[PDB]
Structure formats: structure tokens, C-alpha cells
Amino acid sequence: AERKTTGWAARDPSGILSPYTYTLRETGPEDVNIRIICCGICHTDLHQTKNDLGMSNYPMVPGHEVVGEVVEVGSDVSKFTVGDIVGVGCLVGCCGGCSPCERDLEQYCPKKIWSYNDVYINGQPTQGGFAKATVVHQKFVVKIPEGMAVEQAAPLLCAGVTVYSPLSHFGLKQPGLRGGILGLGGVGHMGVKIAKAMGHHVTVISSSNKKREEALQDLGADDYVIGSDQAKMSELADSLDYVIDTVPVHHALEPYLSLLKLDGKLILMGVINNPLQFLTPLLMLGRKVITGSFIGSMKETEEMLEFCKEKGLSSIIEVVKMDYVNTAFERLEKNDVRYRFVVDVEGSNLDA
Ligand SMILES: NC(=O)c1ccc[n+]([C@@H]2O[C@H](COP(=O)([O-])OP(=O)(O)OC[C@H]3O[C@@H](n4cnc5c(N)ncnc54)[C@H](OP(=O)(O)O)[C@@H]3O)[C@@H](O)[C@H]2O)c1
Ligand SMILES: [Zn+2]
Ligand SMILES: [Zn+2]
């Protein structure tokens, strides 16, 4: 009992998204009721949607990069008022007293609910951003800058911040630094963008030679080297201050750790089921660090956006309507996209 929406949704293993109508919760007293103007896609949306864990809980509505005007607000809600273009991240909830989120790192809290494939504090499966509206916690929605486009603010709610708060916690956003972005796409792309926008010497590393166009002449990278090329990578001996990782599966790390000078950082992002490996020696050569980052806290989701505003950042997004999502996903598998996708839920949703 809340108020009824509609919205596209998967149902079995092979993620074919049907239409789907469902009863929301109600916006009280710390909920924000939003009308979703545009959502967005990335590989997280397929990998939930397919299982790729053997964990997917159907009926499943994808959508964690959302942006759109707020139609209703709580009783204690104060921050936002109606009619604000507001956006919301991956997280929808979390508890309240665990000191992980006394000091604002609320993503590193055990009791976090996600946008979809979770179960909220009331019981309803959290359903995504592929539905023409939703109800979030007022603590898990960030407001939006004056001029930041609704297509442009969306990807940054998960891939834009994913990479920002590594380049913020490990020291890295004070200027100068050399960095090598490994795996140019999604999470690689915003890496190149925000690190080179911080006045850093960014090198792209790659499986292929192919993403050379969307790097040197499009992203603004200072170099491009193949991971599997020993002679060009050896020139980059103890070069970079950090190396980030968008590569999605079991790759060997000591290749990628060579490219690091004294006190360098390997910051792994991707969900890599299977243990990764290292020689305790190399790390002892240069006092080198291996760690992983998980998206961003809302204060740095607040920050990242107003940062992407000031240093005016962008990406080529192919805005598609809602009746083109499974074709957008097949294209996302043949990784065509046109550097990014945004689903503007200003299309096909009505009933059933
Ligand atoms: N905070 C987090 O922990 C976080 C945040 C967002 C997403 N993720 C997850 O991490 C993954 C990646 O991010 P994304 O979804 O935005 O898209 P994505 O990085 O564009 O996905 C593929 C990219 O990784 C590279 N790649 C693939 N296989 C590789 C290999 N074997 N060796 C080297 N490079 C390889 C490809 O570039 P090349 O062909 O040029 O090598 C390609 O650009 C996803 O599974 C996503 O769900 C984690
Ligand atoms: Zn995402
Ligand atoms: Zn907590």
C-alpha cells in the first residue's frame, strides 16, 4: 500500500525485461518520492539480471543511475522540496548507529539495501530505476547542480563516483601524479576524465589496441600501452603513483604492480570472483599497496557532481528510450554503446 507504478523488468536467468507494475511504499516521513526522468545502464545491470553469481532475485527491475524531479516528500523531510531534479545512487538504505556511518562511509556498512535485488526495511524487494518513479530515503538521494544535464548527471551516480573516492582517500587528488587506467570503459572512462581533470598524467593500459581512439583523441590521455606488451610496459618501469582496475575478472597482478614506484597504489574495482595473486617481494621492493574501492558515500556523491560541474566533465551517451533496453543490453554485450547509455523513462511505460 503506497501508490502504483509501472516499469520494465527481468524474470528468469537470461535477462529478458518485460513490463511490470507494482505498488510502492509511502513517502513518509523521511522518504522522497521521485518521478524518474532518466535512468542508466552499465554492466552491473546485466550481471544482476543474468545471475552471474547464481544470486539474482526475480521479479527484477534494473536501475541505479537515476535522475528526476521529486513529486512528494515526507514529514521530517527538509533538505529537498518538491520539483528538484534530484539523483540517487546504488544504495537505498543502511542502518544508523554503526560507526562506519557515523563517519560518513555508509557504503562500508553491513546493513545496506541496494536499488534493486534487495529487500527494504519494510519487506518489499527494492525495485530499480527502469520504472517511471520510486521512493528513496532522503539520506540516499543527492540534489543536483544548476546546469548539470539530466543525461550527463546520471552515469556519475555509480561510475563517476566509483573512481572519484579512490582518487580522494589514498591521497591522490592533490595535483601532479601519474596514473595508469587499466581497462578503458565504464569505470575506465570516468577514471581518465577525473584524474586528468585533477592535473594528472594519465596513461591508459589495455587488452587490445582498439580503444586508442576513445583515449588519446577523445579522453585526453597522455599515453596508451597494451598490458600484454612487455617492451612498452617495461619503459614504464617505476612510473605511476597509482593504477586503477576496471578489468572484470581473474587477471594476474604482478604484471600490473611493476608499473608502480615507491608507495604506489593498485586500486582494484571490478568484482573478481576467484582469488587474485601477488608476490610479497614486489610490494616489499617499492612498499606497494593493494586495495579495493567500492562506489561512493553520499557526501562524495554530493562532491563528485559539483566537481564534475566546475571541471566541466562529459561523456558521449547514447540516449535510448525504454522499448530499446534489451537491444541496448545485447549491444552492451557486443560492447558497442557509443561510449555510454542512458534510458530516458519518458517512453513506453503504461500498464499491465
Ligand atoms: N566500485 C566498484 O567496485 C564498481 C563500480 C562500478 C562497476 N563495477 C563492476 O566492475 C566491472 C567494470 O565496470 P563497468 O561496468 O563500468 O564497465 P567496463 O569497464 O567498460 O567493462 C569492460 C572493460 O574492461 C576491459 N577488459 C575486459 N577484459 C579485460 C581483460 N581480460 N584484460 C584487460 N582489460 C579488460 C575492457 O577494455 P580493453 O579491451 O581495452 O582491455 C573494457 O573497457 C563491472 O562488472 C561492474 O559491474 C565495480
Ligand atoms: Zn552502474
Ligand atoms: Zn551502518
Side-chain angles (χ1 to χ4, degrees), residues 1 3-352:
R3 195 204 132 290
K4 193 197 296 289
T5 48
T6 314
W8 283 51
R11 268 134 166 96
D12 89 308
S14 188
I16 241 68
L17 265 61
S18 302
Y20 173 93
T21 290
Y22 59 107
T23 327
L24 269 53
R25 334 179 286 251
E26 264 313 284
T27 143
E30 266 178 58
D31 286 1
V32 167
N33 195 195
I34 257 164
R35 200 246 305 192
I36 296 188
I37 300 174
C38 80
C39 180
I41 332 167
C42 77
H43 284 73
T44 313
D45 286 302
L46 309 116
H47 295 158
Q48 292 282 53
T49 291
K50 259 48 184 296
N51 272 238
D52 291 326
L53 299 126
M55 296 278 236
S56 188
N57 305 118
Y58 299 110
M60 167 164 236
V61 173
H64 44 301
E65 279 149 274
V66 279
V67 50
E69 192 161 272
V70 51
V71 285
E72 198 169 345
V73 116
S75 315
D76 304 318
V77 187
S78 177
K79 193 169 190 301
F80 321 90
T81 72
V82 182
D84 301 326
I85 300 185
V86 169
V88 46
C90 275
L91 260 64
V92 169
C94 71
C95 67
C98 122
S99 198
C101 51
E102 268 183 27
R103 216 303 268 216
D104 297 61
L105 288 312
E106 15 91 355
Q107 336 82 90
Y108 310 108
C109 169
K111 290 182 76 287
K112 54 175 191 69
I113 295 165
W114 287 29
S115 186
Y116 59 107
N117 206 2
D118 221 292
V119 152
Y120 201 62
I121 265 153
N122 59 211
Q124 214 256 289
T126 328
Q127 299 287 345
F130 278 38
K132 224 169 169 174
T134 43
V135 282
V136 203
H137 201 121
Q138 144 253 37
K139 301 277 281 183
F140 288 83
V141 280
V142 286
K143 198 171 178 172
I144 283 185
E146 192 183 57
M148 185 90 276
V150 166
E151 295 69 65
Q152 264 299 311
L156 342 183
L157 291 160
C158 76
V161 83
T162 258
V163 117
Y164 179 76
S165 58
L167 316 174
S168 180
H169 167 237
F170 300 116
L172 290 7
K173 63 193 300 288
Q174 264 185 145
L177 289 78
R178 292 184 56 211
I181 309 302
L182 172 55
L184 203 268
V187 177
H189 259 270
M190 293 306 309
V192 187
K193 280 145 60 191
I194 289 179
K196 188 62 181 174
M198 284 168 175
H200 298 172
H201 184 285
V202 175
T203 298
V204 182
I205 319 177
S206 187
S207 57
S208 60
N209 64 305
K210 290 191 167 190
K211 289 181 181 186
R212 218 154 195 184
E213 35 77 50
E214 54 187 273
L216 288 168
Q217 288 181 297
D218 240 277
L219 290 180
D222 303 76
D223 210 0
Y224 191 100
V225 59
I226 294 202
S228 36
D229 199 290
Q230 286 190 93
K232 249 287 283 289
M233 264 179 104
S234 295
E235 288 180 53
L236 280 107
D238 303 283
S239 251
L240 307 326
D241 292 270
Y242 61 84
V243 171
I244 305 270
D245 274 73
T246 97
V247 39
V249 79
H250 193 65
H251 62 292
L253 303 177
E254 308 109 351
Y256 291 109
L257 282 159
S258 284
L259 270 69
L260 302 163
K261 63 165 82 167
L262 163 63
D263 297 328
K265 297 129 197 295
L266 231 219
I267 317 158
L268 297 160
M269 312 313 259
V271 170
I272 296 172
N273 65 132
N274 285 318
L276 290 175
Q277 93 293 264
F278 71 114
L279 291 175
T280 324
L282 319 195
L283 303 201
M284 275 238 279
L285 174 179
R287 196 159 59 166
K288 288 142 62 279
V289 171
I290 313 169
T291 191
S293 147
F294 183 88
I295 52 168
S297 105
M298 283 297 134
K299 202 151 190 68
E300 42 240 29
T301 319
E302 281 274 282
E303 281 191 62
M304 177 287 137
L305 233 36
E306 200 71 55
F307 183 70
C308 258
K309 177 199 183 173
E310 171 172 36
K311 327 310 282 75
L313 276 327
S314 288
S315 247
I316 298 85
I317 347 215
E318 207 194 302
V319 195
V320 291
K321 297 294 224 73
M322 186 45 101
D323 50 85
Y324 191 69
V325 274
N326 289 125
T327 359
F329 284 37
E330 168 68 50
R331 273 221 286 138
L332 196 61
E333 221 143 306
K334 71 187 67 166
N335 208 275
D336 220 71
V337 302
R338 233 299 130 172
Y339 300 18
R340 288 202 167 288
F341 277 137
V342 159
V343 200
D344 70 301
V345 216
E346 219 84 348
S348 185
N349 291 337
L350 67 173
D351 51 71

